[PDB]
Write an enzyme that holds these catalytic residues in place. Structure first.
Site, short mmCIF file in Angstrom:
data_model
loop_
_atom_site.label_atom_id
_atom_site.label_comp_id
_atom_site.label_asym_id
_atom_site.label_seq_id
_atom_site.Cartn_x
_atom_site.Cartn_y
_atom_site.Cartn_z
CB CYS A 106 -37.50 -4.38 22.11
SG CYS A 106 -39.12 -5.06 21.67
NE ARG A 109 -37.95 -2.94 26.01
CZ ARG A 109 -37.16 -2.18 26.76
NH1 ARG A 109 -36.64 -2.68 27.86
NH2 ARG A 109 -36.87 -0.91 26.39
CD1 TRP A 278 -47.17 -6.43 16.43
CD2 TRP A 278 -47.56 -8.41 17.49
NE1 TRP A 278 -47.62 -6.14 17.70
CE2 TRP A 278 -47.87 -7.29 18.39
CE3 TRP A 278 -47.72 -9.72 17.95
CZ2 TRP A 278 -48.33 -7.50 19.69
CZ3 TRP A 278 -48.20 -9.91 19.26
CH2 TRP A 278 -48.48 -8.83 20.11
CD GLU A 283 -40.14 -3.34 12.75
OE1 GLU A 283 -39.14 -4.06 12.50
OE2 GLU A 283 -41.13 -3.72 13.47
C1 HEM Z 1 -44.66 -8.34 19.82
C2 HEM Z 1 -44.46 -7.45 18.86
C3 HEM Z 1 -43.18 -6.66 18.79
C4 HEM Z 1 -43.05 -5.32 18.24
C5 HEM Z 1 -44.08 -4.45 17.56
C6 HEM Z 1 -41.61 -5.11 18.45
C7 HEM Z 1 -40.99 -3.91 18.00
C8 HEM Z 1 -39.56 -3.77 17.74
C9 HEM Z 1 -39.05 -2.74 16.81
C10 HEM Z 1 -39.84 -1.77 15.96
C11 HEM Z 1 -37.59 -2.85 16.87
C12 HEM Z 1 -36.62 -2.02 16.06
C13 HEM Z 1 -36.23 -2.98 14.92
C14 HEM Z 1 -35.28 -2.33 13.95
O1 HEM Z 1 -35.37 -1.08 13.78
O2 HEM Z 1 -34.47 -3.07 13.34
C15 HEM Z 1 -37.32 -3.94 17.83
C16 HEM Z 1 -36.01 -4.29 18.27
C17 HEM Z 1 -35.78 -5.46 19.10
N1 HEM Z 1 -36.74 -6.28 19.57
FE1 HEM Z 1 -38.83 -6.10 19.62
N2 HEM Z 1 -40.87 -6.08 19.06
C18 HEM Z 1 -41.83 -7.00 19.30
C19 HEM Z 1 -41.53 -8.33 19.85
C20 HEM Z 1 -40.19 -8.80 20.25
C21 HEM Z 1 -39.95 -10.16 20.83
C22 HEM Z 1 -40.96 -11.28 21.01
C23 HEM Z 1 -38.51 -10.14 21.12
C24 HEM Z 1 -37.72 -11.24 21.69
C25 HEM Z 1 -38.32 -12.24 22.30
C26 HEM Z 1 -37.95 -8.83 20.72
C27 HEM Z 1 -36.56 -8.38 20.89
C28 HEM Z 1 -35.98 -7.21 20.23
C29 HEM Z 1 -34.51 -7.07 20.14
C30 HEM Z 1 -33.40 -7.94 20.71
C31 HEM Z 1 -34.40 -5.83 19.37
C32 HEM Z 1 -33.17 -5.08 18.93
C33 HEM Z 1 -32.62 -5.72 17.69
C34 HEM Z 1 -31.26 -5.09 17.49
O3 HEM Z 1 -30.67 -4.51 18.44
O4 HEM Z 1 -30.78 -5.25 16.36
N3 HEM Z 1 -38.97 -8.03 20.08
N4 HEM Z 1 -38.52 -4.58 18.35
C1 LIG Z 2 -29.97 -7.92 14.33
C2 LIG Z 2 -30.45 -7.15 13.11
N1 LIG Z 2 -31.13 -5.91 13.51
C3 LIG Z 2 -32.59 -5.98 13.32
C4 LIG Z 2 -33.25 -6.96 14.29
C5 LIG Z 2 -34.75 -6.76 14.25
C6 LIG Z 2 -35.51 -6.68 15.42
C7 LIG Z 2 -36.89 -6.47 15.37
C8 LIG Z 2 -37.52 -6.38 14.12
N2 LIG Z 2 -38.87 -6.16 13.96
C9 LIG Z 2 -39.86 -6.76 14.63
N3 LIG Z 2 -41.04 -6.27 14.69
C10 LIG Z 2 -39.55 -8.07 15.26
C11 LIG Z 2 -38.69 -9.10 14.95
C12 LIG Z 2 -38.78 -10.13 15.87
C13 LIG Z 2 -39.70 -9.95 16.91
S1 LIG Z 2 -40.45 -8.39 16.68
C14 LIG Z 2 -36.76 -6.48 12.94
C15 LIG Z 2 -35.39 -6.67 13.01
C16 LIG Z 2 -30.64 -4.77 12.71
C17 LIG Z 2 -29.18 -4.38 12.91
C18 LIG Z 2 -28.68 -4.09 14.19
C19 LIG Z 2 -27.34 -3.73 14.36
C20 LIG Z 2 -26.49 -3.66 13.26
C21 LIG Z 2 -26.97 -3.95 11.99
N4 LIG Z 2 -26.10 -3.88 10.96
C22 LIG Z 2 -26.37 -3.69 9.67
N5 LIG Z 2 -27.31 -2.94 9.29
C23 LIG Z 2 -25.46 -4.36 8.68
C24 LIG Z 2 -24.76 -5.58 8.70
C25 LIG Z 2 -24.00 -5.79 7.54
C26 LIG Z 2 -24.05 -4.78 6.58
S2 LIG Z 2 -25.09 -3.53 7.20
C27 LIG Z 2 -28.32 -4.32 11.81
BR LIG Z 3 -46.88 -3.22 20.81
#
Ligand code: HEM
Ligand SMILES: CCN(CCc1ccc(NC(=N)c2cccs2)cc1)Cc1cccc(NC(=N)c2cccs2)c1
Ligand SMILES: [Br-]
Ligand code: HEM
Ligand SMILES: CCN(CCc1ccc(NC(=N)c2cccs2)cc1)Cc1cccc(NC(=N)c2cccs2)c1
Ligand SMILES: C[C@H](O)[C@H](O)[C@H]1CNc2nc(N)[nH]c(=O)c2N1
Ligand SMILES: C[C@H](O)[C@H](O)[C@H]1CNc2nc(N)[nH]c(=O)c2N1
Ligand SMILES: [Br-]
Ligand SMILES: [Zn+2]
Lengths: 407, 411
Positions: A106, A109, A278, A283
């Site tokens: 993330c 953070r 947000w 993205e």
């Molecule tokens: C406040 C504004 C925030 C921004 C701009 C931000 C930004 C991001 C971005 C750009 C990603 C990559 C998402 C992707 O490519 O699918 C991400 C991943 C993540 N964020 Fe943040 N974030 C924010 C808030 C938060 C909050 C509030 C949480 C949890 C309380 C959080 C937990 C995570 C987690 C767990 C991932 C990884 C998701 C994954 O592994 O699939 N984010 N975030």
């Molecule tokens: C858990 C899903 N994440 C995206 C989570 C996510 C986190 C952050 C954001 N963006 C934000 N700015 C925020 C979301 C919430 C707080 S900030 C958007 C999405 C994507 C992901 C991770 C790992 C594997 C996959 N897998 C896949 N792409 C597939 C599944 C089935 C077919 S393809 C997708």
């Molecule tokens: Br930020």
């Protein structure tokens, strides 16, 4: 064993010690690096509980106090007796904020401490889950001045009584496979869209249809609910120079809110824990719009721009990509919906890394995810070495509930 | 054990068994991933196993494994090691070896080309003048009037570690850097330290923004000596843009032959500490990194001012806009002058086809994602969506310390 990370643009060196707290495993070994792979009882519980309560009482400077010992004893008795335990509100909030703090993927953070936590552990039905979610959506949207929040449903018990939100995000657009062989709307969501359809959702079959919520309480079959449209803030996508841009008919939603992850605090598992903050501009503009398997709009935009599409070496994709991303940012800003560009966000994250090194002795960070998917090297995170490792409390992936659920 | 990698754009899943031959260590453990860390005398003792394993590989590749010719080679290397403490590679084994070090280079996107590598054998070289001569021939053969050809030149291997051959330059052709008294830098800031060594050593510097550095050459553990590459041998390209006629007025050029001269080539336990190799450029190396890193030429601001972009806020993406124009300019210039160059779309797509082929024929392809993904437009290149397994195979190219840090001066 005490490790250095160098920024190659600034020469700043940071020493990491926090990694030696790392509990969980990476997927890597001495022989093979897995850095680019997307997905690498009572007896079990008390160690996890103690480890967590230890860091909690230390964070409030009461490590080794009677109050610390007392709680450790209390939780210990509760486990022996009940085979689980309950978190005090303060511990829940701390657990949640720290799971975000520890999210190595993330970039956002720097904000971790300002999280709004909604305790929904008293929820019992999908209707109840629906109400909690709408309240979360409204609170977080805040008329466009977005505020971070998480809503925490009851923890796993025997694993046959799980709370799940089946949606991957609270707000996402539908995907329909069409006779033409192609796809309408968001191809990422075709399967979930079909599960909603076979569940009974009348689908408008448009390019940008807000999906219904499919909510599961206490392991029951999940139930459909529509989010009141007044609660879904959306942004029409226009460009500040290109008049024709609006004719593409692009919009996106303001509130990204991840609803398929699993929150682990002190061994306890919260399988329904939708959280939201947000958007970073890329993205939507790079991934949602331009991924070949997403809306995939680069061809159309390049055409309208009348660029030489005859050779990859004209960098027409690159040219169109920038413009699409200028438009996303421009639209959100014009409409007063919070958004961050990739420059600002990666600059913040460097400043955050610095604080965490000074204050915590480190910051787990996954370079592969933290570097934005456009203009990598012109953002500071590209030049920044990062150590990736797994700390708890954490957010974790869990299987899509429909592969698990017994109907 | 079989390991799977998935492409998340195409759902193509590949299976890796090659990592099974991986000996060297990654820098990672089960508790830490060091996947983004930049840098994560041998005795008779350890030499023969290294030799054996390499010759086993060599003889397998030529379908002569277990042959009389194979066994006798093993025994002869063995006798030679214990008699002399080292051994000499045959020409064919050297060739095979250099090609494999490139093939095994997990940070290299241009590996589809690995089997076409011109190997120049400079192991009879004894002096710095001899080295200068081998390097000119290399630069001229590789340049080929703009139709670039891959080559490597291989100087004698390490012996006691006191008689090393080294090229002190980091690339054969590279621009000087000059730190000014006002704290500013003239020319390429990456090369300030090496530039000062050349000056110390007696190079009279022109002091412009694009001065080709002299060669600093170390033969046989002796103090290094200075030589100027004949300018007629240095192919350069003035950078102009196909629509912005003021672009030429920025005064940019680059050289066409990228040639790495500071790495160590390891083959069957032998260490070749001077092994300059060359291929051709991917456009982004110049357009993104050389021109636009803050610590290099840093032209983003000047370019964006000239394009009259909104510079008051980063959310205008002025930087991203300027970056694309610079990169178009770089590719346009090379193509117009008929100097081989490859853009990042085309080179990443070839890499994916290379990698799939390597999985099918070889059982794997070690790849470092952090390095393979281009420094602009990441996710619109297919490598961003490709999962990769990184591990270390021999033969290999390795880092080694800068020679001014270790060399024992004679006078
Ligand atoms: C406040 C504004 C925030 C921004 C701009 C931000 C930004 C991001 C971005 C750009 C990603 C990559 C998402 C992707 O490519 O699918 C991400 C991943 C993540 N964020 Fe943040 N974030 C924010 C808030 C938060 C909050 C509030 C949480 C949890 C309380 C959080 C937990 C995570 C987690 C767990 C991932 C990884 C998701 C994954 O592994 O699939 N984010 N975030
Ligand atoms: C858990 C899903 N994440 C995206 C989570 C996510 C986190 C952050 C954001 N963006 C934000 N700015 C925020 C979301 C919430 C707080 S900030 C958007 C999405 C994507 C992901 C991770 C790992 C594997 C996959 N897998 C896949 N792409 C597939 C599944 C089935 C077919 S393809 C997708
Ligand atoms: Br930020
Ligand atoms: C055919 C033309 C070639 C192209 C377009 C190509 C492309 C690249 C690029 C873009 C990099 C990253 C450089 C950086 O960011 O610093 C790289 C790294 C590398 N390449 Fe290739 N390459 C080619 C030929 C070769 C040859 C002939 C060899 C050796 C025989 C080679 C071995 C390597 C090695 C060892 C690295 C890593 C450098 C390091 O780790 O610092 N390349 N290549
Ligand atoms: C060993 C030098 N490499 C660059 C090697 C390189 C490889 C390939 C190319 N480009 C080519 N297209 C080819 C060159 C030769 C054949 S193909 C150019 C350079 C960079 C590097 C690697 C590891 C550490 C460092 N350390 C450093 N000192 C710094 C990096 C950035 C700021 S300082 C530098
Ligand atoms: C294969 C690779 O691990 C995968 O494509 C990753 C790369 N980096 C990413 N980075 C972010 N922020 N989000 C992603 O989904 C991905 N995908
Ligand atoms: C810290 C980080 O590993 C470092 O900046 C790397 C990132 N990826 C790279 N990729 C390539 N091809 N070349 C580089 O110099 C770098 N630098
Ligand atoms: Br190539
Ligand atoms: Zn790793």
């Amino acid at each position: 064993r005490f490790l250095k990370v160098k920024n190659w643009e600034t020469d700043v060196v940071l020493t990491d010690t926090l990694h030696l707290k790392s509990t969980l495993e990476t997927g890597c070994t001495e022989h093979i690096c897995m850095g680019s792979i997307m997905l690498p009882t009572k007896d079990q519980l008390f160690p996890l509980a103690k480890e967590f309560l230890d860091q909690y009482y230390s964070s409030i400077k009461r490590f080794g106090s009677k109050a610390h010992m007392d709680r450790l004893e209390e939780v210990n008795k509760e486990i022996e007796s009940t085979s689980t335990y309950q978190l005090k509100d303060t511990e829940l909030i701390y657990g949640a904020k720290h799971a975000w703090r520890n999210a190595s993927r993330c970039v956002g953070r720097i904000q971790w401490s300002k999280l709004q936590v909604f305790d929904a552990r008293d929820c019992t039905t999908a209707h109840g889950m629906f109400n909690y979610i709408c309240n979360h959506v409204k609170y977080a949207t805040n008329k466009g001045n977005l505020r971070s929040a998480i809503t925490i449903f009851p923890q796993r018990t025997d694993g046959k009584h799980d709370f799940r939100v089946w949606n991957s995000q609270l707000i996402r657009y539908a995907g329909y496979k069409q006779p033409d062989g192609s796809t309408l709307g968001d191809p990422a969501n075709v399967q979930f869209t079909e599960i909603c359809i076979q569940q009974g959702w009348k689908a408008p079959r448009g390019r940008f249809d807000v999906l219904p919520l499919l909510l599961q309480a206490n392991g029951n079959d999940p139930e459909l609910f529509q989010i009141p449209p007044e609660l879904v803030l959306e942004v029409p996508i226009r460009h500040p120079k290109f008049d024709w841009f609006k004719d593409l008919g692009l919009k996106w939603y303001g509130l990204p809110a991840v609803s398929n992850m699993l929150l682990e605090i002190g061994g306890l598992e919260f399988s329904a824990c939708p959280f939201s903050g947000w958007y970073m501009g890329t993205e939507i503009g790079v991934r949602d719009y331009c991924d070949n398997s997403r809306y995939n709009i680069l061809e159309e935009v390049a055409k309208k721009m009348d660029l030489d599409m005859r050779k990859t070496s004209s960098l027409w994709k690159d040219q169109a990509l920038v413009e699409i991303n200028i438009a996303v940012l421009y639209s959100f800003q014009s409409d007063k919906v919070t958004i961050v560009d990739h420059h600002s966000a990666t600059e913040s994250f460097i400043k955050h890394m610095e604080n965490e090194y000074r204050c915590r002795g480190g910051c787990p960070a996954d370079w592969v995810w933290i570097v934005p998917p456009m203009s990598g090297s012109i953002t500071p995170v590209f030049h920044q070495e990062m150590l990736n490792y797994r700390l708890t409390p954490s957010f974790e992936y869990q299987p899509d509930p429909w592969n698990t659920h017994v109907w």
